[PDB]
Every structure is written in structure tokens, then in C-alpha cells.
Design a protein around this nucleic acid. Structure first.
Length: 223
DNA sequence: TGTATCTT
DNA sequence: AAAGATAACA
């Protein structure tokens, strides 16, 4: 048992020997020698440990991990107990409450329950230097997450991609818009939420698009 | 003081 | 690129 889930390691292993990835991991290792980097090494790839790669039905793509202590744990927008939901997640919960009739604030911020149902909780960038948002951008993470999105695009049909924010939206060109459903809106952060996130109804729309393709809907309340 | 996005 | 301007407030 390791950092990468078996099925993800098997299909993404071709990236490991590529120069950008070797250099990216070197950069991250060097950053950890001088600064506090989030999430810890063992949690950078938690998004690969929740379900099999072939069981992915929905992909939520954020910007980068939470940059505060004890927050990021490798699943986008998620925080393990007893850490309270950060601002971006409180906004996700508010949208879910107005979008899904049965949804109420669960009392925690752990999104493992969604990930276990086949919801890939990914960020465009997978590490961040403490207290500095998007500090690890354009270092190689985007090419790796492009590989993840491209694999899902080429080897699956009818997935739902929820691209939240400008950085996540750059992955729109790696997806065949006629074969998969791409939903784009502003990032849920308080700084951008009013630019489209509130009222986007992405959660009900995702379930309707899944049910149309004959696939089982996501139980957003299963947390 | 802190949690994006567009403009210069 | 990086910094300034900007909308939203617990």
C-alpha cells in the first residue's frame, strides 16, 4: 500500500520517467527543505486512493490545495475532522443546500464520501507553499494533471467535468466537449463566488447528465 | 489580516 | 511576470 492507488499508478506511470515530472518532484522536495508545503508527502495523491480509475464518473477540478495548517489532504476542497470547513467549502455547502433539496451542512468538511462514489476531487496544481495561494503553479503540476484529464478523456465516455475557476478552466481544451459534459463556473472562494458559483446548480445538473447516460447519480449527502 | 479575477 | 484594482464580509 502506497501513495498512488494501484489502478492510477498503472495508467499514469508513463509520466514518472518524463523530465518535467522528475524536475517537479525535485522542486517540491527542495521547497520542503526551506518551507512548509501542503499537503504532506503522503497526502499529495489521496485523490488516487478513494476509488478505481475506471470507476470515475465525475471530476471536480479546483485551483491548488488549501494553504493553511492542517487543511489540505489531497482531495480538493476537503478537510479532515476536526478541521472546520474553510471559506471555499462553506460556499460549496451553501450552493448544495439551495441546489439539492435534501442537502444540509454535514457538520464537517471531509469529502471522502464523494470521492468513494467516483467523484475525482482534483486540483490543477497539487502542492502549495504555506500561506501563499497558487505559489506552486507553472512548475510542472499542470502537465501532470493534463495527463490525468487526458487519460480520462481518451479512455472514457460521458464523464461530467466541473471546472471551478480560471486555472481549472485551462483544462477545457484537453476534453472532447461532444463526448463528455464540461460545466464551468467561478471558483467558490469568497473572492470570486459571486461571479457565477452561487446559482450554478452544478450538483443537480451533474446528476441529471449522469442519469441521461444511464449511470447512477451522486448522493451528495453521502458524507 | 484573511479567504479570485481582470487590468496595466 | 508581477502588481495594482476590484466587491464581499465573517
Amino acid at each position: 500500500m502506497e501513495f498512488f492507488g494501484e489502478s492510477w499508478k498503472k495508467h499514469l506511470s508513463g509520466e514518472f520517467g518524463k523530465p518535467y515530472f522528475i524536475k517537479l518532484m525535485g522542486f517540491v522536495a527542495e521547497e520542503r527543505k526551506h518551507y512548509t508545503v501542503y499537503p504532506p508527502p503522503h497526502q499529495v495523491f489521496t485523490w488516487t486512493q478513494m476509488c478505481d480509475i475506471k470507476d470515475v464518473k465525475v471530476v471536480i477540478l479546483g485551483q491548488d490545495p488549501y494553504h493553511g495548517p492542517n487543511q489540505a489532504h489531497g482531495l480538493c476542497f476537503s478537510v479532515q475532522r476536526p478541521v472546520p470547513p474553510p471559506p471555499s467549502l462553506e460556499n460549496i455547502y451553501k450552493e448544495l443546500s439551495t441546489d439539492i433539496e435534501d442537502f444540509v451542512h454535514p457538520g464537517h468538511g471531509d469529502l471522502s464520501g464523494w470521492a468513494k462514489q467516483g467523484v475525482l476531487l482534483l486540483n490543477a496544481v497539487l502542492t502549495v507553499r504555506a500561506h501563499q495561494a497558487n505559489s506552486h503553479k507553472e512548475r510542472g503540476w499542470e502537465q501532470f494533471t493534463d495527463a490525468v484529464v487526458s487519460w480520462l478523456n481518451q479512455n472514457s465516455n460521458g464523464l461530467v467535468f466541473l471546472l471551478w475557476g480560471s486555472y481549472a478552466q485551462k483544462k477545457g481544451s484537453a476534453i472532447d466537449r461532444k463526448r463528455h459534459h464540461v460545466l464551468q463556473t467561478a471558483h467558490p472562494s469568497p473572492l470570486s463566488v459571486y461571479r457565477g458559483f452561487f446559482g450554478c446548480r452544478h450538483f443537480s445538473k451533474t446528476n441529471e447528465l449522469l442519469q441521461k447516460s444511464g449511470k447512477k447519480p451522486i448522493d451528495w449527502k453521502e458524507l
